[PDB]
């Protein structure tokens, strides 16, 4: 790919590329940026921060190698997404990199300084618990993004705190990382070894290939529990390790629950371990409605779990629907009730709860 590298007005290196906008028909335009620095790195590729020369706005550039071995739907999925709780894809372009005669995909996204993981880690090493107001705010926005992507039949398949971007000043949450995401179609099998450790739904650990979008809800339940607890609720290196932790909390799944997850395991005689009461799982100061919500997300039977839209309407988020709520810093809460017909498509009558009367004006 052609990439003009020059200097301008201050000796500051300026990179110019012809990039295709994320939305609408492909109409590529010249994009110039500067102040490039690596802010993330891994086996997937590199993530840079940069400053657009025109607007001066900061952006993240996710540079991933075109791996022909696996299927990557990250580009095609992000291009059709447009929601306030999902990180925006501004532009994308192709270029070379470390590998000789190889082509890399560059994703130009909005830059968001923090993640839910980094914020949670601060409170953990400070021996403090994240204030319930933030737990409500972050979880609610997560469920909205899930309700949005699920309405298109898209499953994220990698929900975890590290993939939840935060702007601490505005308390706005943005879902990111769609490298594992996929449009689920009933009748077509999916890879089982998906989702990150600690956040993998039990049916995935049991090796199901016919799972649904409800695996994202389980993972969201794990994030919620983690925020309340100050650490992962189901840690473990292997699938068995994680399943033991789950069983130690939920108790041994019944045959019917096993069948709902994976029918191939219904005839094994697993020892009967008693469930540990949710009120005993969390600290004694934990809000009852947070415990209630969490128990409706972390269910063995995938169809029994709440939908993301139903989760938004849960009593735990009632405070957010109060007219007089403000952030601890003094600012107002972000946009929370600007639901579209698409977001509500799964359950339109929920609008009565989701949109408070003071929001309709």
């Amino acid at each position: 790919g052609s990439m003009k590298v020059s200097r301008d007005k201050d000796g500051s290196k300026v990179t110019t590329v012809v990039a295709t906008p994320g939305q609408g028909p492909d109409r590529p335009q010249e994009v110039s940026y500067t102040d490039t620095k690596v802010i993330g790195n891994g086996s997937f590729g590199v993530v840079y921060q940069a400053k657009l020369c025109d607007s001066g706005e900061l952006v993240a550039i996710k540079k991933v190698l075109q791996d022909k071995r696996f299927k990557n739907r990250e580009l095609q999925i992000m291009r059709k997404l447009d929601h306030c709780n999902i990180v925006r894809l501004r532009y994308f372009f192709y270029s070379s990199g470390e590998k000789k005669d190889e082509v890399y995909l560059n994703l130009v996204l909005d830059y968001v300084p923090e993640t839910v993981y980094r914020v949670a880690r601060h409170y953990s090493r400070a021996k403090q618990t994240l204030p319930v107001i933030y737990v409500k705010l972050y979880m609610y926005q997560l469920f909205r993004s899930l309700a949005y992507i699920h309405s298109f039949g898209i499953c994220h398949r990698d929900i975890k705190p590290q993939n939840l971007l935060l702007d601490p000043d505005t308390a706005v949450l943005k879902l990111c990382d769609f490298g594992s995401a996929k449009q689920l179609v009933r009748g077509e099998p999916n890879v089982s070894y998906i989702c990150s450790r600690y956040y993998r739904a039990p049916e995935l650990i049991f090796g199901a290939t016919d799972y649904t979008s409800s695996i994202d809800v389980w993972s969201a339940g794990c994030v919620l529990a983690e925020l309340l607890l100050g650490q992962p609720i189901f840690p473990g290196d292997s699938g068995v390790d994680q399943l033991v932790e789950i069983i130690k909390v939920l108790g041994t799944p019944t045959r019917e629950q096993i069948r709902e997850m994976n029918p191939n395991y219904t005839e094994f005689k697993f020892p009967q371990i008693k469930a540990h009461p949710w009120t005993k799982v969390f600290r004694p100061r934990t809000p009852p409605e947070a415990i209630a919500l969490c128990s409706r997300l972390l269910e063995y039977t995938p169809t029994a779990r709440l939908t993301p839209l139903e989760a938004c309407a849960h009593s735990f988020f009632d405070e957010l629907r109060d007219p007089n709520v403000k952030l601890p810093n003094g600012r107002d809460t972000p946009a929370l009730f600007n639901f579209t017909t698409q977001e509500l498509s799964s359950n339109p009558p929920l609008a009565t709860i989701l949109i408070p009367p003071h929001a309709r004006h």
Binding site: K68, R69, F70, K71, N72, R73, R157, G179, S180, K182, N190, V191, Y193, I194, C195, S196
Partner: peptide, 6 residues
């Protein structure tokens, strides 16, 4: 964990 192979 990676997605489905080609």
């Amino acid at each position: 964990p990676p997605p489905t192979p080609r």
